[PDB]
Amino acid sequence: SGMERIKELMEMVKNSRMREILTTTSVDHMAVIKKYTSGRQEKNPALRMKWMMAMKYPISASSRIREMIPEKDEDGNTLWTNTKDAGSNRVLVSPNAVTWWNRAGPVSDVVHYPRVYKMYFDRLERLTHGTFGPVKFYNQVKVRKRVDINPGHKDLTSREAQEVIMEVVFPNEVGARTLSSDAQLTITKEKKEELKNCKISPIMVAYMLERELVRRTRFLPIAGATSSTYVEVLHLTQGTCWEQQYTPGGEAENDDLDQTLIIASRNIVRRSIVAIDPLASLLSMCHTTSISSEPLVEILRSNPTDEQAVNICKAALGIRINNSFSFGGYNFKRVKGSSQRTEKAVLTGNLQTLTMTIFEGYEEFNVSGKRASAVLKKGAQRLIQAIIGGRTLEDILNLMITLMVFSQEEKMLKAVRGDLNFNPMYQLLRHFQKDSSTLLKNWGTEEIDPIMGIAGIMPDGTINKTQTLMGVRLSQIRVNIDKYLRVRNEKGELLISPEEVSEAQGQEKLPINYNSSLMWEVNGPESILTNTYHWIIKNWELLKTQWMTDPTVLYNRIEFEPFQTLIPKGNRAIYSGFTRTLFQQMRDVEGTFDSIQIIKLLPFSAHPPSLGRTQFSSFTLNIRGAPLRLLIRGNSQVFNYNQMENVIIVLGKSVGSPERSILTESSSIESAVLRGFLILGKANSKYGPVLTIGELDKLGRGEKANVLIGQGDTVLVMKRKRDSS
Amino acid sequence: YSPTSPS
Amino acid sequence: MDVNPMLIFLKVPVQNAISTTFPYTGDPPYSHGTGTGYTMDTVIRTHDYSSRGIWKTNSETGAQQLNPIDGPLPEDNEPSGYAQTDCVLELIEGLDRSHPGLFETACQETIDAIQQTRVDKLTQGRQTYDWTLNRNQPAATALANTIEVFRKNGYKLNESGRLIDFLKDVLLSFENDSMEVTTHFQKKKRIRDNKKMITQRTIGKKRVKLTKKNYLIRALTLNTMTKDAERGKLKRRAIATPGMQIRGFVYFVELLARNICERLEQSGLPVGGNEKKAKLANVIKKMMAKSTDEELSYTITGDNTKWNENQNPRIFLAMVLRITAGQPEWFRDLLAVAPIMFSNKVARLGRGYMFESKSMHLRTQISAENLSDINLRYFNEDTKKKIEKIRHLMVEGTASLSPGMMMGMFNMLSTVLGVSVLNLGQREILKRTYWWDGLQSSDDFALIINGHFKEDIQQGVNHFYRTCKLVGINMSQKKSYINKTGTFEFTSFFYRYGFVANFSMELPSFGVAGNNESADMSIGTTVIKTNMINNDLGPATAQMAIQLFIKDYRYTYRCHRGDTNLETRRTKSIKRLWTETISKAGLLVADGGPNPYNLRNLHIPEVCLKWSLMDPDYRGRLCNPNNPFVHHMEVESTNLAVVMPGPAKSLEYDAVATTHSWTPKRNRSILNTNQRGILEDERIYQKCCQVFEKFFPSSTYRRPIGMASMLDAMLSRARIDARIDLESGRISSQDFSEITNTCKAIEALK
Amino acid sequence: VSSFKANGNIEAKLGAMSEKVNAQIESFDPRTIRELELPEGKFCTQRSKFLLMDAMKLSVLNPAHEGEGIPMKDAKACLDTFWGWKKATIIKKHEKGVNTNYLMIWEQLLESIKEMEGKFLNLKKTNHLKWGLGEGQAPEKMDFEDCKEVPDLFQYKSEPPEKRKLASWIQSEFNKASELTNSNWIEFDELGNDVAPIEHIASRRRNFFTAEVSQCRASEYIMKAVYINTALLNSSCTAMEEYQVIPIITKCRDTSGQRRTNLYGFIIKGRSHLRNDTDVVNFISLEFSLTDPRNEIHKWEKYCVLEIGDMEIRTSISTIMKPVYLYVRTNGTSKIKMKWGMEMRRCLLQSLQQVESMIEAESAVKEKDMTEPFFRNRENDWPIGESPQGIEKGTIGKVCRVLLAKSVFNSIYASAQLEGFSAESRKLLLLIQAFRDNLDPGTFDLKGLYEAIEECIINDPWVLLNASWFNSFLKAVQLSMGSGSGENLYFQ
RNA sequence: AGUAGUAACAAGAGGG
RNA sequence: UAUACCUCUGCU
Ligand SMILES: [Zn+2]
């Protein structure tokens, strides 16, 4: 009706105190007087509540409570009083009033409340339909990272979300702006439909929608899956020393599945290369591995992701590579190279930025359709060459335009005039498909040799034998994979190399379980370091006698293969040479023996060594993108023998205690540090000035010198006479 | 489990 | 055997067993009585560190103002405040070079803010000093009080609604030399009663004009009080509260400094705990990558002594002007206001002191204003000396305090000064045998120094240390220390080749928050949850933390389980509910029901967790939207509590609005004072705002904008709502005339 | 400012500034450094709100749960188990107090309990009780004008606290706090059922923790504090004008399973118009004991000890006759102190997450749940004490109870001294740790740090004992290392 | 007396 | 001046 509201207003406007305020203070100023209070924010609410709960009437409530519940309950407890709460018309009330309501108050209808509180009830839905696996115990590596904390956020900005909320709950009071996107329209109609006729405060509906719609993030330490539904249950899935395997209810998003598939395939390919039979190792891991508790092989059979490592996994399983797609009406099939994808935004000739998914790398397509074919050679925003043919000049030219847009050249972008308004690749296409006059003048022309069968095409539309639009010429797949994972065509030419796979290490969105003997328990490179150095300490006495007696069997242990993926390919050989040479010096120079140095450098053995005689103050290891450096002399971030604990600390994680023998184990001479040299002790100026490691080749055999060996230390060094095996 | 001490 | 817990450190590293050194299960220190002793201590010490500077009497206030900047260079390691303007500007220029376009976009974002910001925005935040009453008051009342007195005199630019116009009114108000303020005072009336005549306390108001000094002194006044509950310190210290005049300017300056700090790797502010750790992890990563295998690394676990007392308002004016270089001069001058008011700031000296006579057995209070003229026979030797030194600075009750700062005045711009010294340490600027990087948040810093030999580190430290002295920063030699990089401490985070847990820091957050039954259950379970994630709270202890919280919650709210033999004021009514209820599992803990929580479901709100298992009638009562217990607040302040770890932030929680979402009774001490009328103002303002929301429902979600009147806006809506409800709807023809007659009747009453 | 450009400004001034302004790195070796100096004075008195190791209980077998029944009814049930009450006599005087008031309060209380007929007991405001609870002892508030010219009107005594010496008793108290008892002091409320495997693992580990912690003597003290402070706070609020009696009760279950109600004594609450969070409530505690106060009279400075009875105590094969004392004293607390006393169960959390992290740290390395091995085997052990034989090691269970005692004692003896001492000495410990990690630590002003620490060691038994503990730890670290350029960083 | 600790509480204000 | 009462307040 709106009859009781205007009646109450006149009744208030009768009061001169109220009419004073209602006229003088503006709509802007009403925000100030609404929050005008004598009440301080409480500094010790914990204390005050313990103090106040001892009192008879600590709760304040609306005075209408006196008409709704009785003054006394059945047992004689006073439920409400008439004492007004300071600064309001509310009255002081007992906790027994809350209990009375809950057991004998008015019942209302609340069956649609789960729709209003959807953000909460979806958490219970996920947990109720969640599945638990086993608990594994291991050093749990946690990367502090910004992640989503609002699973099922329909992704919108705060301003966009405000318009949606206003439309739904306060439909009459919306401002000038309207529902701009179809995201906003579908969400508004759905919310209006779901929340229709639900007796609840509109303030609460507006609140829950605000929390539901707008994306929110936090920096959190995360081991494993980073997806929102996994982030939600970090307390349950990870501790300091344990992983509780768990799959939330509901289906994983394809975005997350594609991201994790790529990571899994790369890790599989990286592991396989360092094994003796890479193709068999890859095949073994593919059959054992699962992503989000789904086997990797059935994912590969139905997932259309195009990526070098994934394609190698598909090749090994004999399943077709997503080698092709269709654009502008024509089917593009890639015959050479690969698509590295970089999402950026570029300025046109109109001075208008656009979010493109620009492609890098040398690529080569066979293109066909609409009575016209072409061989395209393309670089990063570069049409290298297009040899186009077709039944009509109209048709050849149509394909030329499509190719000139598909190139993504700066020529064609800067030749755009006016605004693009009809995905943004098709927005450039439909523009140039209805006017290409500036495109062709701005494209530019080149001279060519007159070859028989080939002709050029000018901007005007004529055919010219020795001139043509830049890069354009006019004229009229079974796959195999070998032992070493090289993917070739029927002609025997390289399509995909394992070596040319992307080195990028991102963290999985969904959980990956390889279930392989070739892999360690946990996913990731920090785990590889810890499990490797843990294994060496655990089986030390076995490996120590295997070091003395039969060293080539020790170096070729397959437990060192995961560690080898962390070493750069080029360095593996020389590091093994340097390592093996340094170990045999400890064997040759009798008396000296450093077990910590053996344990530190032992995993760098596992590769056929090179005979090159270069020097190293550190071996490099690729860990989550950044190179880290394991120092040859003493402790570093990667390897840290801490004598106080008698523990080897690998990237901040205790890896085990070595034998207490090793605490009391030293010698003047240090044998396993420099190739063909021995460290004797402290620096002595008697033996010349200080040198670097690169300057050591000048010393004669037997001659001694001072060296800046590492970490600010300066050291005396002799060149030993005989070399080692 | 019943805890014990040398005492 | 004598038991000694410290001997655990023989086996267990100190970082790994650091929880044993944090005694945070006992009551922290509280100040009893006045903080005037501490406020004078601070004011005296502030001037001692700047004592070689240049004294000058102020033209407008007559306050004796010490200026130490560009003063004599220090000749000892004692706390100095002789910051050199040119050295500051070099560091701020260095910061500009190293981050091209930062100052530009920082200013550009702060420009957009100033345009868009409304006067509303100062209703938010902590208590401000009110010049109207010479006391602390809530932000919004101090705002409304200043607007009222400004409106009563010749100042109404803020009637627009935008904040910059309110800021104009503040600068224009200094020109008035007869500023009028209504005070209040008690009056003892006598009235008959039925047939005896009893005395009656009542309150009436009286107008008072103020001098040009009086008003100006009060607008430059910052309140003082002792900081309570502060851990890790034998002695108490003084803290300060800004006034209403300076606050809106401070907002925009801190906003600039925030936008700067947001894009500086070396700033700890304003990011949270985990991101501070990530930032520290990055500089260690970056320092190790850019060094050679020949080089060394040492880390200073760092503390700056006397941080606020030696940071000068004049230096802050240099920074602000250099950061804003090439921007519009109105924007430079606007942001320059706050540092200027800080340079001419005066401090209220507090409650005063209490005297006692043993032989007579009496006590008496004297104000801090009386410290100027009072006889010194009363005081002890130390207090007497402090009063004699403070008398030289004293100006109409307050004490002048030009140099330095005080705690709780100003935030992030001091970190920018520190970060600029960290930025000086790049290889490409220093070009020495040493170089540095690190992180800073206020007085605390972690500095990493790399060099070729240990002698280079020493030279690096001295260069850092002495450069810091040149901008009024004093590294503590007592509390800072150095070691090889690998372990350090930073704001009670402990790094040992990686950050380790400091769970005992969080121990005071394990308990019953005291908001209400709904919020506390959500808060409590979430404290357990967030500590499992962030501070290595293991699963067994976390289960036990649930158990103990439920015990504490049940006892505190007297809501023991419905089948208990206990006896409280609530046991009988809870028993009635228990026996009446079919599905007991669905009863909330506050209604005598069982605890549902374990590790797996801490993130699920209680009502949500028990919803399937509730009796229909109980659930329908519990979540009844017509219940008289809830305070229907704004959306922006829905499901917010307040917490103290930082200053004093808000904690959002997840809960369904129920009869348990109640609010405890307000404090009633105001009823005995002269400010008693403020309660009635509030009651009247609330009924006015309540009725407006019946015409503008969306005002509870989005603050409505309008220079028009509150009554006139309601009247416009009253007519047109009646129109569409009849024209095409379910309202009769007779009722449209009935509504518009009332609107015309209201329009007649004005 | 707009036209400023850098031109060697800092470099110039760095040349200009005195070379006395520096930060010289002094290398830190813990073999070099001295023990912390503890203050001299009179000995530190007991200052807890209730008796610790010296407490004595009257009890009844009682099926009631961990806080069930009416307190005074339960209290009388406990009194009726004991006969052989004597005419009360003062055996140790409270030197600064009128001791016959303390005696009269006991006799009044006992008689008022006998004559009570209700749920609660409020005592009559007699002279002896008024003195004991500080009735009328606030000076009367006047305006300054009216009292300006009084000769002895000064400001309140605002000196630093009087120094006190470390006494033996506090080390003894801590030893008893770390012990196992035959009773389960803490009953834990229910959890939701375990579903996740990790919840089952948790519960298995929680079984170990629960017994170890519930049976520890420190947990008995937790339960006394939670009861007393809850009772005082609630009565402070509701009965502001009454001198209300609060019996000191705890409930527990044996190892044998029998539920039991214990009575330690009584507390008489003064007036309690508590406004500020520091405002004081005066109370009188009257607590049973078999401890002869004359054997350690410095411990009891604040108490007036009575001899109130004789008890026939049963042993192996001989009934022994011991006198029963009543330790009476006036004491005080505040709303804030009571709040934190009500919350003392969080001490359980402090101990247990340190212990669980130790269990979890090895579990990570060993790749298996090391819960069961740690509690049941004795291969894993940590240094936690000193006998004449040497440094004694304890098992994880012992470590748990020592850490629980530490946390409980931090709560019972909270002070600004402890706050300051704990914060400043942590720096010195970290320097010692840095040295032991072979990280070449350096101090700038080591004398200043020692002063920051030593400034906080004034008069508190707990802070005094912690200072001593640091020195004992320092000395133990020095010995395991010894002289040399390559000292044994590893312990044993 | 006792709490306490760099200054307070040990009721304050009013019916004057 | 004392002794009874009565009223408000317990973070303001
Ligand atoms: Zn209970």
Name the residue facing A2 among C285, C454, C725 (closest C-beta).
C725
How far apart are the C-alpha atoms of D386 and C232, rounded to whole Å?
A: 29
Q: How far apart (Å, rounded) are the C-alpha atoms in residues A103 and C590?
A: 13
How many residues make up chain C in this entry?
A: 750
- C533/A32 Cβ within 8 A: no
Does residue C34 reach within 7 angstroms of strand E, measured from its CB? yes
Measured from the Cβ of residue C93, the count of other Cβ atoms closer than 10 Å reads 17
Phi, psi of D112 (to 5 degrees): -70, -30
- The experimental resolution of this structure, in angstroms, equals 2.7
From the CB of residue D66, how many other CB atoms can be counted at a distance below 10 Å? 18
The DSSP letter of residue A332 is E
Q: Which residue is nearest to nucleotide F6 (CA to C1')?
A: C198
**Among the listed residues A369, A435, A362, the one whose alpha carbon sits nearest the alpha carbon of residue A405:** A435
**CB-based contact, A49 to chain C, within 8 Å:** yes
- Nearest chain A Cα to C643, which residue? A43
Strands C346-347 and C221-226, bridge-based pairing: parallel
Name every chain A residue with its beta carbon within 8 A of the beta carbon of D234: 54
Rounded Cα gap, residues D432 and D422, in angstroms: 15
Among chain B, residues having any CB pair with chain D shorter than 8 Å are 1-5, 7
Which residue pairs from C284-293 have beta carbons closer than 8 angstroms and sit at least 24 positions apart in sequence? C284/C448, C284/C485, C285/A626, C286/C437, C287/C437, C287/C448, C287/C450, C287/C485, C288/A628, C288/A629, C288/A637, C289/A626, C289/A627, C290/C427, C291/C450, C293/A617, C293/A618, C293/A629, C293/A631, C293/A710, C293/A711
Q: Which chains touch C (3 or more CB pairs under 8 A)?
A: A, D
How far apart CA C532 and CA C601 sit, in angstroms, is: 13
- Give me the count of residues in chain B: 7
DSSP, residue by residue, A566-617: HS-HHHHHHHHHHHHHHHHHHHHSTT---HHHHHHHGGGG-SPPP------S
C458 three-class SS: helix
CA of A84 to C1' of F2 (A): 38
- Closest of C308, C401, C389 to residue C67, by C-alpha: C401
Contact D476, D31 (CB under 8 A): no
CB contact under 8 A, D354 and C17: yes
Contact present, C274 and C429 (Cβ < 8 Å): no
Pick the residue from chain C with its C-alpha nearest to A131: C600
Structure tokens belonging to residue A151: 């699973």
Tokens representing D46 are: 């007991």
- Render the burial of A542-574: b for 16+ CB within 10 Å, e for the rest: ebbeebeeebeebbebeebbbbbbbbeeebbbb
Query: b or e along C20-39 (b: 16 or more beta carbons within 10 Å of the residue's beta carbon)?
Result: bbbbbbbbbbbbeebbbbbb
Distance CA A447, CA A467 (A): 5
Amino acid at C596: P
List % helix, strand, coil for chain D (3-state, nearest 5).
40, 20, 40
Tokens describing residue A338:
């690969």
Say whether C302 counts as a known binding-site residue.
Answer: yes
Q: For the CA atoms of C242, C243, C244, C247, what is the dihedral angle to 10 degrees?
A: -30
Contact D155 C355 (CB under 8 A): yes
Strands of C11-157 (E only): list them.
54-57, 64-67, 128-130, 135-137
Can you say how many angstroms the Cα of residue A56 is from the centroid of all Cα atoms in its chain?
56
What's the distance, CA D213 to chain centroid? Answer: 16
CA–CA gap between residue A144 and residue A155 (Å, rounded): 23
D197 near A244, Cβ under 8 Å? Answer: yes
Half-sphere exposure of C588 (CA within 13 A, CB side): 31
Chain centroid to Cα C229, Å, comes to: 15
Calculate how far, in angstroms, residue D192's C-alpha sits from the geometric centre of ligand 1. 15
Asked whether strand F has any atom less than 7 Å from the CB of C612, the reply is no
- Could you tell me if A512 and A289 are in contact, meaning their C-beta atoms sit under 8 angstroms apart? yes
CA–C1' C228–E7 (A): 14
Q: Show the tokens assigned to C639.
A: 């499901």
Tell me: cis bond preceding C270? Omega within 30 of 0 counts: yes
**In angstroms, rounded to a whole number, what is the distance separating the alpha carbons of residues C100 and C106?**
11
Instruction: Give me the sign of the Cα torsion angle D290, D296, D299, D301.
Output: positive
A182 phi, psi to nearest 5 deg: -70, -25
Using alpha carbons only, how large is chain D's radius of gyration in Å?
27
For residue D52, what are the CA distances in angstroms to D46, D57, D82, D220, D282? 10, 12, 21, 9, 20
**In contact, D453 and D428? CB cutoff 8 Å:** yes
Q: Is the CB of C357 under 7 A from strand E?
A: no
CB contact under 8 A, A242 and D198: yes
- Gap between the Cα atoms of D246 and D224, Å rounded: 12
* Experimental technique for the deposited model: X-ray
Token pair 């894009």 in the structure block, residue? C263
Query: Does residue D211 sit at the B interface (CB-CB below 8 Å)?
Result: yes
| Containing structural domain, residue A48 | 1-250
The residue type at C276 = K
**Backbone phi, then psi, for A485, in 5-degree steps?**
65, 15
Locate A72 and state its tokens: 């006394």
Non-local (6+) Cβ contacts of C417 within 8 A are C88, C91, C311, C315, C319, C471, C473
Contact D92, D297 (CB under 8 A): yes
DSSP-derived 3-state class of residue C241 = strand
Beta strand D122-123 pairing with D140-142? unpaired
Q: Are A468 and A475 in contact (CB under 8 A)?
A: no
C491's tokens: 């704001």
Cβ atoms C293, A631 nearer than 8 A: yes
Q: What residues does A580 pair with on adjacent strands?
A: none
Q: How far apart are CA D85 and CA D91, in angstroms?
A: 15
Cα(D357) to centroid of ligand 1, in Å?
A: 28
Q: Which nucleotides of E are covered by protein (CB under 7 A)?
A: 1-16
Pairing of strands D122-123, D243-254: antiparallel
Return the sign of the alpha-carbon dihedral for residues A113, A116, A122, A123: negative
CB-based contacts of C192: which residues, under 8 Å, 6+ apart? none
Distance A443 CA to E4 C1' (A): 89
Question: How far apart (Å, rounded) are the C-alpha atoms in residues A543 and A548?
Answer: 9
Q: Which D residues, 114 through 173, put their C-beta within 8 Å of a C-beta on chain C?
A: 138-144, 147, 150-156, 158, 171
DSSP-assigned states of every residue in C165-205: HHHHHHHHTTS-SSEEEEEEEEEEEEEEE--EEEEEEEEEE
Q: Please answer yes or no on whether D360 and A132 come within 8 Å at the CB atom.
A: no
Count other Cβ atoms within 10 Å, centred on residue C141.
26
For strand E, which residues in window 273-302 of chain D come within 7 Å by CB? 273, 275-276, 278-280, 282, 302
| Contact predicate D329/D51, CB 8 Å | no
Residue A91, phi then psi, degrees to nearest 5: -120, 155
DSSP per-residue string spanning A258-309: HHHHHHHHHHHHHHHHTSSSHHHHHHHHHHH-EETTEEHHHHHHH-----HH
**Looking at beta carbons, which residues of chain D come within 8 Å of B1?**
207-208, 211, 375
Q: Which helix (H) or strand (E) holds D183?
A: strand D183-184
Determine which helix (DSSP H) or strand (DSSP E) holds A60, and give its type and residue range. Answer: strand A59-61
Distance D251 CA to ligand 1 centre (A): 13
What single string gives the DSSP state of each residue in A430-443? HHHTT--HHHHHHH
Q: Is the CB of A56 under 7 A from strand F?
A: no
Q: Please give the structure tokens belonging to residue D160.
A: 């630093």
Rounded distance, CA D302 to CA D332, Å?
A: 12
- For residue A169, the surrounding DSSP H or E stretch is helix A158-169
DSSP codes, C271-307: --HHHHHHHHHHHHHHHHHHS-TT-EEEEEEEEBTTT
Instruction: Enter the tokens of residue A194.
Output: 């779901």
Q: Is the CB of D253 under 7 A from strand E?
A: no
Q: CA A705, CA A696: separation in Å to the nearest integer?
A: 9
What is the Rg, in whole angstroms, of the alpha carbon atoms belonging to chain B? 6
Chain C and chain D share a number of CB contacts under 8 A equal to 433
Helix, strand or coil, per DSSP, at residue D102: helix
Ligand 1 centroid from CA B2, angstroms: 24
| Chain B contact present for D414, CB below 8 A | no
Helix (H) or strand (E) holding C388, with range, is helix C381-393
Residue A171 has what DSSP assignment? G
Residue D390 distance to chain B (closest CA, Å):
16
Distance CA A324, CA C370 (A): 89
Residues near ligand 1 ion, CB 5 Å cutoff: C 554
CA D427-D433-D434 angle, 5° bins:
90
Q: Which of left, alpha, beta for C720 (phi over 0: left; psi -120 to 50: alpha)?
A: alpha
- Token match 């049409």: residue? A383
Q: Identity (one letter) of the amino acid at C134? A: N
For A138, counting Cβ atoms within 10 Å of its Cβ (0-12 exposed, 13-18 middle, 19+ buried), the class is buried
Which nucleotide has the least CA–C1' distance to C678?
F12
Amino acid found at A472: V
Distance in angstroms (rounded) separating the CA atoms of residues D327 and C171: 68
The answer to whether C303 is annotated as binding is yes
Q: How far is CA A719 from the centre of its chain?
A: 49
Inter-chain residue contact B5 with D397, CB threshold 8 Å: yes
